[PDB]
């Protein structure tokens, strides 16, 4: 029993991608364009729309996170977005 | 918590006795009423700070430049009729 | 309180529970085998015997 070696000692216990990429797609932008009333479009719009998201979403995101930090809430609620929308000049009803 | 669903419900009922409501629309109306109240009330506060001093004239004038005049005259007239009804 | 002691039991202990045979085989499938450790035993025995 004592002499020799073998695996019968269970173990001691050791330890044993977060980059993320932007989404959206061309058909979604095409549907949004068709909602806006455009007959024909060129092939250079999608990059610019993606730029509009990359310039619009992140700013309100920063304002929202600094607001909820100013509220001393370690979580984000839908009501926090409404403050950002109000100070951005485009308010949303329903939340 | 005191909701405002009852008042808007009875106003809809006295203006439309067979038209229903949707839950999303209830929040829509609640937010509309709340933010209009706050907007006109801070307008009244800034109109009180307008005069070099510490009523109803301030609120009448505040509603008199915040919303289009066509509905503004009706608003002030019906408010005055309401206060006359409440006076005695 | 002045009784005739307690002579009726004669040290009864029928099973309940076997020390190691119950844990290893009672009955089949190594009760609560959770095959990972049964595989541990098998692999250790195989590697030891095969050198």
Curated annotation (Swiss-Prot), chain A:
Family: Belongs to the histone H4 family.
GO molecular function ontology, one term from the record: structural constituent of chromatin
Keywords: Acetylation, Chromosome, DNA-binding, Methylation, Nucleosome core, Nucleus, Phosphoprotein
Protein name, entry field: Histone H4
Subunit structure, as described in the record: The nucleosome is a histone octamer containing two molecules each of H2A, H2B, H3 and H4 assembled in one H3-H4 heterotetramer and two H2A-H2B heterodimers. The octamer wraps approximately 147 bp of DNA. Histone H4 is a component of the UAF (upstream activation factor) complex which consists of UAF30, RRN5, RRN9, RRN10, and histones H3 and H4.
Modified residues (N6-acetyl-N6-methyllysine): 5, 12
Residues modified to N6-acetyllysine: 5, 8, 12, 16, 74
Function summary: Core component of nucleosome. Nucleosomes wrap and compact DNA into chromatin, limiting DNA accessibility to the cellular machineries which require DNA as a template. Histones thereby play a central role in transcription regulation, DNA repair, DNA replication and chromosomal stability. DNA accessibility is regulated via a complex set of post-translational modifications of histones, also called histone code, and nucleosome remodeling.
Gly residues composition bias: residue spans: 1-13
Swiss-Prot record, chain B:
Biological process according to GO: chromatin organization; negative regulation of transcription by RNA polymerase II; postreplication repair; regulation of DNA-templated transcription
GO cellular component: nucleosome; nucleus
Effect the entry attributes to changing residue 11 to F: Confers UV-radiation sensitivity
Coiled coil regions, renumbered to chain: none
Cross-link Glycyl lysine isopeptide (Lys-Gly) (interchain with G-Cter in ubiquitin) mapped to chain: 85
Modified-residue entries (N6,N6-dimethyllysine), positions: 1
Assigned protein family: Belongs to the histone H2B family.
Quaternary context: The nucleosome is a histone octamer containing two molecules each of H2A, H2B, H3 and H4 assembled in one H3-H4 heterotetramer and two H2A-H2B heterodimers. The octamer wraps approximately 147 bp of DNA.
Protein function: Core component of nucleosome. Nucleosomes wrap and compact DNA into chromatin, limiting DNA accessibility to the cellular machineries which require DNA as a template. Histones thereby play a central role in transcription regulation, DNA repair, DNA replication and chromosomal stability. DNA accessibility is regulated via a complex set of post-translational modifications of histones, also called histone code, and nucleosome remodeling.
Protein name: Histone H2B.1
Taxonomic classification: Eukaryota, Fungi, Dikarya, Ascomycota, Saccharomycotina
Gene: HTB1
Full-sequence portion shown in this chain: 38 to 127 of 131
From Swiss-Prot, chain C:
Record PTM Phosphoserine, positions in chain: 7
Coiled-coil parts of chain: none
Compositionally biased region (Basic and acidic residues): 1-9
Annotated segments matching region Disordered: 1-17
Location relative to the cell: Nucleus
Superkingdom field: Eukaryota
General remark: Present with 1680 molecules/cell in log phase SD medium.
Family from the record: Belongs to the SWC5 family.
Quaternary structure and partners: Component of the SWR1 chromatin remodeling complex composed of at least ACT1, ARP4, RVB1, RVB2, ARP6, YAF9, VPS71, VPS72, SWC3, SWC4, SWC5, SWC7 and SWR1, and perhaps BDF1.
Primary role: Component of the SWR1 complex which mediates the ATP-dependent exchange of histone H2A for the H2A variant HZT1 leading to transcriptional regulation of selected genes by chromatin remodeling. Involved in chromosome stability.
Annotated protein name in UniProt: SWR1-complex protein 5
Gene behind the chain: SWC5
Range within the parent protein: 203 to 253 of 303
